[PDB]
Amino acid sequence: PSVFLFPPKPKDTLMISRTPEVTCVVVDVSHEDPQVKFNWYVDGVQVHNAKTKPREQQYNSTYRVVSVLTVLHQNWLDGKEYKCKVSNKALPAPIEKTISKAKGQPREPQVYTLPPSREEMTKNQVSLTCLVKGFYPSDIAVEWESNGQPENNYKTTPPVLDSDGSFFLYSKLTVDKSRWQQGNVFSCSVMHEALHNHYTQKSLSL
């Protein structure tokens, strides 16, 4: 039997508008004694209930059980600790797994937008690059936009640990050299802990 505990989605914890949850999963649960008890403690105090919810699932020749605890945005950011205590009769003692947002002195990220290279103009499409760096923790999110709709073609690299214990990352928005020379403006959006409203925007235009 194994118990995997999962953290909320970065973007959920950063917008009060959303809902962030912590997912506790259990695998290899005796096909014989499938009964399973879950315990949830925030910082140390059980919330067993706290609108916590699961449901059985027969798999392998074994069973799988998911439990989901809804978290409070400020609770998560203010670094509360969450614990999942799974107990089963076909198990010696129960298993406990804890989790909490990445600990550490927060750093406000610096967002830089860079136009395409003077050389990439040869090509039909061009790259709009967003340099985001100096942030901590890693939990971050970046999206592009041209107006009341989000640009579709763009990939963002994962966070890379820099030399100053801080992370950086680039996001690259592919756009038809046309839309770019025409004059349109694109925006690099960033939702991070250390931002004023956990949010910020940087513009880009011919």
Ligand X SMILES: *[C@@H]1O[C@H](CO[C@@H]2O[C@@H](C)[C@@H](O)[C@@H](O)[C@@H]2O)[C@@H](O[C@H]2O[C@H](CO)[C@@H](O[C@@H]3O[C@H](CO[C@@H]4O[C@H](CO)[C@@H](O)[C@H](O)[C@@H]4O[C@@H]4O[C@H](CO)[C@@H](O)[C@H](O)[C@H]4NC(C)=O)[C@@H](O)[C@H](O)[C@@H]3O)[C@H](O)[C@H]2NC(C)=O)[C@H](O)[C@H]1NC(C)=O
Residues that bind a second copy (CB under 8 A): 110, 112-114, 116-117, 119-120, 123, 127, 129, 131, 133, 153, 155-158, 160-163, 168-170, 172, 174
Residue 172 engages ligand X in binding (rule: CB under 6 A): no
Rounded Cα–Cα distance for residues 189 and 52 (Å) = 33
Among residue numbers 6 through 25, which ones bind ligand X (CB under 6 A)? 6, 23, 25
Partner that binds at residue 113, options ligand X, a second copy, none, CB closer than 5 to 8 Å by kind: a second copy
Partner that binds at residue 64, options a second copy, ligand X, none, CB closer than 5 to 8 Å by kind: ligand X
Residue 60 engages ligand X in binding (rule: CB under 6 A): yes
Partner that binds at residue 185, options ligand X, a second copy, none, CB closer than 5 to 8 Å by kind: none
We find the least distance from the C-beta atom of residue 177 to ligand X, in angstroms, to be: 38
Residue 65 engages ligand X in binding (rule: CB under 6 A): no
Residue 62 engages ligand X in binding (rule: CB under 6 A): yes
